[PDB]
């Protein structure tokens, strides 16, 4: 694993000392080399999981996130290469360093076994994000947004830690697969119930429900492309991975400790998908769509069925990539205009003839057009939920419909009307942003082709 980390810990001094004319290219290409080397984990010949020490490990549920992160790093770099163009070399170097620290932390956590290490990394993820969001935004409320982000996250963090302590004491160790081979069952009293809470509350507060979805839009809006990318892609996924790895112990509590959370997740999926219709701000629309899909993820995580877990992982990866892509497109249309509003720029596709086909290929992946990992996940999760009850296809379908609606609303208020006549600032497409779109897409094709990699624990 050091083979993945150490070079990512060398990109930093590399950035510091390299000359301005060359740091961008050098660090970018070498981060791509890191992404490449990050595939050794896929030599999972047999079912014996990979273990490198008492301090690291890998797994089928973690490897995807690792590669996706090591591959979203350079895309953040590139998408962060036209703005802050008049900001000093030292400042842009700081930005690069923060991105790289995010990468390294995310890798170490998605790999680590001991949930306490996982937790310290899960909470160290903040500093770079808070910074990136406050020191490089474009509005004023970014401050309140960062505050909300930080404090939601830490409120979650605390009882999680307290329960990790209670465990480490009652049980002997915290190492995973030992928690498995020596788990037990609980008398199911108010004590163990509040323990279940203090263990899942943080992961949920992070992966937003209806009740606490508030810090997502502010972040994705006030913050720049890279922060938006990384939020929509991974910093949510951390909660899901933690919940998956930890729920192994709390059996059986999660049968009746789920109804409220499943209910909230579904209702929130619906209401947020509806708001996605009448939400002006494009990035806010995208954020609420992300909420709508992560609600499915959660409803599939709780009930603990194998189909459900595989669908969760599929939809997870798919949404990560697709949201990064949509945010790239938004930023693109913003740098030329400097207004997030959806109804200002209209009737494109007459001057950006190609870009549309990078807009289209995203929506179709949002509304679950097959053959896509998106629909595979949505469908397996709907199957699990139908088994768990026959009266949830209702909500699945309402969500599918409202999505099929607002995805096209977005396509049609930006690439289907008639062109304005005062947007003389429409610098044509840059090879760079076209490349970012292509790189976010192509992997969707290859994974639609061969998804056995992207299944999960149960496959």
């Amino acid at each position: 694993m050091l083979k993945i980390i150490l070079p990512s810990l060398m990109l930093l001094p590399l950035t510091w000392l390299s000359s301005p004319k060359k740091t961008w290219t050098n660090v970018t290409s070498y981060s791509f080399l890191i992404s490449l080397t990050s595939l050794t984990l896929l030599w999972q010949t047999d079912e014996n999981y990979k273990n490198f020490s008492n301090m690291f490990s890998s797994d089928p549920l973690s490897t995807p996130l690792i590669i996706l992160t090591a591959w979203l790093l350079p895309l953040m770099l590139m998408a962060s290469q036209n703005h802050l163009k008049k900001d000093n070399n030292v400042l842009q170097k700081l930005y690069i360093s923060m991105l790289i620290s995010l990468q390294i932390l995310l890798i170490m956590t998605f790999s680590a076994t001991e949930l306490i290490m996982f937790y310290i990394l899960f909470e160290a993820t903040l500093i770079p994000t808070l910074i990136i969001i406050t020191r490089w935004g474009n509005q004023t409320e970014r401050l309140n947004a960062g505050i909300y982000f930080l404090f939601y996250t830490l409120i979650g963090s605390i009882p999680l830690l307290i329960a990790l302590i209670l465990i480490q004491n009652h049980v002997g160790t915290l190492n995973l697969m030992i928690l498995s081979f020596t788990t037990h069952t609980l008398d199911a009293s108010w004590s163990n119930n509040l323990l279940w809470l203090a263990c899942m509350m943080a992961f949920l507060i992070k992966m937003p429900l209806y009740g606490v979805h508030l810090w997502l839009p502010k972040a994705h809006v006030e913050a720049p492309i890279a922060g938006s990318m990384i939020l929509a892609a991974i910093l949510l996924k951390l909660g899901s991975y933690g919940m998956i790895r930890i729920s192994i112990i709390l059996d059986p509590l999660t049968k009746y400790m789920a109804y409220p959370f499943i209910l909230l997740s579904l209702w929130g999926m619906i209401m947020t998908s509806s708001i996605c219709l009448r939400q002006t701000d494009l990035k806010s629309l995208i954020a609420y769509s992300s909420v709508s899909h992560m609600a499915l993820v959660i409803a599939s995580i709780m009930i603990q069925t194998p189909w459900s877990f595989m669908g969760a992982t599929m939809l997870m990866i798919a949404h990560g990539l697709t949201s990064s892509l949509l945010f790239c497109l938004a930023n693109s249309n913003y740098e030329r205009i400097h207004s997030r509003t959806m109804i200002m720029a209209r009737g494109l596709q007459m001057v950006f003839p190609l870009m549309a086909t990078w807009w289209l290929m995203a929506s179709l992946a949002n509304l679950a057009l097959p053959p896509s990992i998106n629909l595979m996940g949505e469908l397996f999760i709907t199957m699990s939920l139908f088994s768990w009850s026959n009266f949830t296809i209702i909500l699945m379908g309402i969500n599918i419909i409202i999505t099929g609606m607002y995805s096209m609303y977005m396509i049609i208020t930006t690439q289907r009307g008639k062109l304005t006549n005062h947007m003389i600032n429409l610098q044509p497409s840059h090879t760079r942003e076209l490349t970012l779109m292509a790189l976010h897409m192509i992997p969707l094709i290859l994974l639609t082709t061969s998804p056995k990699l992207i299944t999960g624990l149960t496959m």
Binding site: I127, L143, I147, L161, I162
Partner: protein, 344 residues
């Protein structure tokens, strides 16, 4: 203050605690306490301005009552047994009085409403000592007598300090008073852990010191004792920020830094000893300290406030005050979490 006087006073200040600790007699302890008190008052009152004099009066009065109370305790112990030292056979009221006095002498709450006023009246190079070389002997006294204490009131006092310090820090702008409230809270953490494992109070104290001293160095730099006077650091000297931000987040106790480790292993001990409720309160109310550190991070680094023209006349100049130990302690605070086991 001529050099002979300066040297003698610094010597007595460096002595008081040394005796208070190395002595096994409570009278010698009380003596060292009085040494610190006396030898310090001047350093507070040197400027001879009204505010300094007022702060001196407050400080002296409170610490006098405290010392006399501790003396009453010792004498009652004498009448009771005969020895000048505390044993495991002393009526708990005496311990409770000793604890009230030590608290009032430290700054714990609700005996704390005199620390912010004084620390606002004082300059920096004496508030630093007031917070980092006067809270040692009073803590050594406890280190000696931790077994037979009253956990109930110790915990009530600690958590009360947590709450009140945080709630006051949410408002106070004056950085001196902010630092004072932070001291209150951290000493609350210590007293909370104390009767279970003292080494952890030692650790919390050393860490709070290593985080405070360099902040006060960065302040002594400019005599910027206000938020709108420190926000101008990015135009006076844009270098201290990459370390001030870290140190304040640390004082808050963010995991990847070191300021977290104390709270972490402390909660561990309290969970071993079944105090998880108060542990939860402490952990869920340190977040306000974290808050009003973040709110200064904002003002200084993450966003640039309006400067003042004459700062150009300043920048034309130079400055070589900031010695090496500042950076040394900053680093050995922020980037030393991997070495917690080697710290225990």
């Amino acid at each position: 203050m001529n050099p002979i006087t300066l040297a003698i006073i610094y010597f007595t200040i460096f002595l008081g605690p040394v005796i208070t600790m190395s002595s096994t007699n409570l009278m010698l302890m009380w003596v060292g306490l009085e040494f610190s008190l006396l030898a310090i008052i001047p350093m507070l009152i040197n400027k001879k301005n009204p505010r300094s004099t007022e702060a001196a009066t407050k400080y002296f009065v409170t610490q006098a009552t405290a010392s006399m109370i501790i003396l009453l305790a010792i004498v009652l112990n004498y009448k009771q047994l005969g020895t000048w030292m505390f044993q495991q056979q002393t009526n708990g009221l005496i311990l409770n009085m000793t604890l009230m006095a030590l608290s009032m002498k430290l700054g714990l709450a609700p005996f704390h409403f005199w620390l912010p006023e004084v620390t606002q009246g004082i300059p920096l190079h004496m508030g630093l000592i007031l917070l980092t070389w006067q809270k040692i002997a009073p803590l050594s006294i406890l280190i000696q007598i931790y077994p037979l204490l009253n956990s109930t009131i110790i915990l009530m006092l600690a958590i009360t300090s947590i709450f009140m310090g945080a709630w006051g820090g949410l408002n106070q702008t004056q950085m001196r008073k902010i630092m004072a409230y932070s001291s209150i809270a951290h000493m609350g953490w210590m007293l909370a852990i104390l009767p279970y494992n003292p080494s952890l109070t030692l650790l919390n104290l050393m860490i709070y010191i290593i985080l405070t001293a360099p902040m006060f160095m960065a302040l002594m730099l400019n005599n910027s004792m206000t938020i709108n006077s420190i926000s101008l650091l990015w135009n006076k000297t844009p270098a201290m920020l990459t370390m001030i931000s870290l140190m304040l987040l640390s004082l808050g106790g963010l995991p990847p830094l070191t300021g977290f480790l104390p709270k972490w292993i402390i909660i561990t001990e309290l969970m071993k000893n079944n105090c998880l409720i108060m542990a939860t309160l402490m952990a869920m109310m340190a977040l306000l300290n974290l808050f009003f550190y973040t709110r200064l991070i904002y003002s200084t680094s993450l966003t640039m406030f309006p400067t003042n023209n004459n700062s150009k006349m300043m920048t034309h100049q130079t400055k070589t005050k900031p010695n090496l130990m500042f950076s040394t302690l900053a680093i050995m605070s922020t980037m030393t979490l991997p070495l917690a086991p080697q710290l225990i």
